[PDB]
DNA sequence: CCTGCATCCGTGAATCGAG
DNA sequence: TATAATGGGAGCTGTCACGGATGCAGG
């Protein structure tokens, strides 16, 4: 009556079916702000207090269509068999395969007819290097054994006497090698045939080009740069300590494990790419990268424009909860509200304590003037309770017990009958129920436990 | 409406962990514990104090209370002084604070995830004196213990190590809370061992065993007398509200008299004894009666030695013992003649 | 939106004996 | 203290007639 709550509502709050709002703190829901004393479900509480998020499992063997940290709209397709149902930032969970592109910068030579090739200070991938009317035969200018290194397209020939390389030649697209790996070549014999036009491969790019004229041909000392991929398989008991597109040198750790063995250690300079996650976590949150020591920590709740990281050069745009990622090196703010919504007689006792009886008396007195019958009736009943508490001097929060009394032992006796057997009252079993559940609660609170 | 069904619904919301997810959470927890250790090595503060501070910020301001194990009182002022003291550390050091936070958060998620296990276990322990929900919550305590004592390096599925601690907590609870007259756990194991013993014997002999027969099958140190004593101890009390008759108008405790409070006969007899004793002590002088009243404790309620009574009246202790002999002897002659105090001999 | 009727839940249901 | 185990289980049905509060469609 006092809190204007029906039997159903007061039941739901007291027996922890639904929450009740004490101080909304600017929280809103589905377009309308949170009003005080509004009953919200557990799902409404998790969506408000802790923000909304969802994890979508990915079918075996299939890779992801989207990337890490990519902003995702509702209805956007993340996987060939999975479609996201909400707006927010997408995150990888547990990558099955880690592909590392190792950086390689080498020098390699090539000889072509002067009339055929196009003079350029450098060369791009796909860019035509030469145009050959008649098929030309590239000839070995040194003696030794052939080491054939093949790319996705294009090749590398390393001729060597003993274990020392005597020469290194480059074979762009449109050039078919006429030798196998480990073949012995003399001076003059054809290594490859360049038929028609020839261009640079999609993967490798020529940084610098040094040309030298000799006879009717030209020799090109090329400074090349490319990346060679290497796949690493990750086990469920292993975790990746390296973010997307991160830079690592020799010795750096990529994937840790239970034992020192099977650990993935970066062999040389290269970039890291994650593929095939266990699932994808779509979170409604704001991404804030940091390049310096972060002041805020994970677990903290923050209002828009609060000091976050890098001495305060980055701040929050929205209301939410701070989740510090040290892997991707980014401070996340999960879109949520710091809202005070409770359950049980602790929340009820609070609402009863905050009640000013004089104000409600006046409000209901003004309400008693209304022409409607039901209005006057219910207001009379409510005012009867208010007048009762005011005249008596009792406080409404005494209807909720902080300290439950204990009836004297002789009025709930434990006695030994004639046969030496014991007989006791049911109140003792009831009190034991109370003390047990109370003490267990105090222990569960002390050690700390999930809210469930 | 239904507390059991409601808790089962609150449990069905949290999805079950994948092997990767479970290992991840356990990993962050363990690394979190190491982070608290390292932060204690640096800060120079109590690991428990640090853990509770990290635990407070993770859980939020919704829970603020004093921890028994901690020396200082835990309040929002203190936890803010410490949190700011922790965030006053450099990059490589302050990292551990983030690790500790992430660890506690993973701990919350891990305990929240495996509550289904506790339910499917505690469901078997029903009917032993504790309610279903009581068993579940006690298994939840054991679940918490299992989480904090777990080591993910062993590649064991968490359910395997959790089950042991869960059963342990439940059994401890049943052993402690069941009996109205609380009995030590070891003694309960003894009594239950006596139960399985007597039931084994009754199953093989086709009848209920004697005290001596159980004494034999129990082994050394067990005779019929000790068995009977053990059974006497295991006897539980019965309710005073036990129904008497097929109507509801009668209770068991209605037929039990009060043995403590004095009947009017007792109080009247006691008063008559005090009066007759004073009538007897008035057949003496005031001095030789005062010696006795101080000797046996009628006055002041204390029995005095001969030295104190002699220190009061001013005579020697032998004079006091002489006076008390004369007084008692006079009371004997008074008794032999009057025949008054004889009936009070009981 | 406000009255009226259907409907829900909670509360009662003699005394004394003995048992 | 370690294989792994992950949403319960039994309901009581043949009284009755009252006041009062809740909720419904109807004027
Ligand atoms: Mg024996
Ligand atoms: Mg009626």
Curated annotation (Swiss-Prot), chain A:
Name recorded for this polypeptide: DNA-directed RNA polymerase subunit beta'
Family (UniProt): Belongs to the RNA polymerase beta' chain family.
Included stretch of the parent chain: 114 to 565 of 1524
Binding partners and assembly: The RNAP catalytic core consists of 2 alpha, 1 beta, 1 beta' and 1 omega subunit. When a sigma factor is associated with the core the holoenzyme is formed, which can initiate transcription.
Lineage: Bacteria, Thermotogati, Deinococcota, Deinococci, Thermales
Its biological purpose: DNA-dependent RNA polymerase catalyzes the transcription of DNA into RNA using the four ribonucleoside triphosphates as substrates.
Swiss-Prot record, chain B:
Entry comment, domain topic: Contains 4 domains, connected by flexible linkers. In the active conformation, the domains are in an extended conformation, each making extensive interactions with the RNA polymerase catalytic core. In the autoinhibited state, sigma-70 factor domain-1 packs closely together with sigma-70 factor domains-2 and -4, contrary to the extended conformation that is seen when the protein is part of the RNA polymerase holoenzyme.
Lineage: Bacteria, Thermotogati, Deinococcota, Deinococci, Thermales
Coiled-coil stretches: none
Annotated region (Sigma-70 factor domain-2), positions in chain: 110-180
Entry keywords, A to Z: Cytoplasm, DNA-binding, Sigma factor, Transcription, Transcription regulation
Main location: cytoplasm
Quaternary structure note: Interacts transiently with the RNA polymerase catalytic core formed by RpoA, RpoB, RpoC and RpoZ (2 alpha, 1 beta, 1 beta' and 1 omega subunit) to form the RNA polymerase holoenzyme that can initiate transcription.
Record GO biological process: DNA-templated transcription initiation
Family of this protein: Belongs to the sigma-70 factor family. RpoD/SigA subfamily.
Main function: Sigma factors are initiation factors that promote the attachment of RNA polymerase to specific initiation sites and are then released. This sigma factor is the primary sigma factor during exponential growth.
Protein name according to UniProt: RNA polymerase sigma factor SigA
Residue numbers spanned by region Sigma-70 factor domain-3: 189-267
One function term, GO molecular function aspect: DNA binding
DNA-binding region: 306-325
Annotated region (Sigma-70 factor domain-4), positions in chain: 280-332
Subcellular location: Cytoplasm
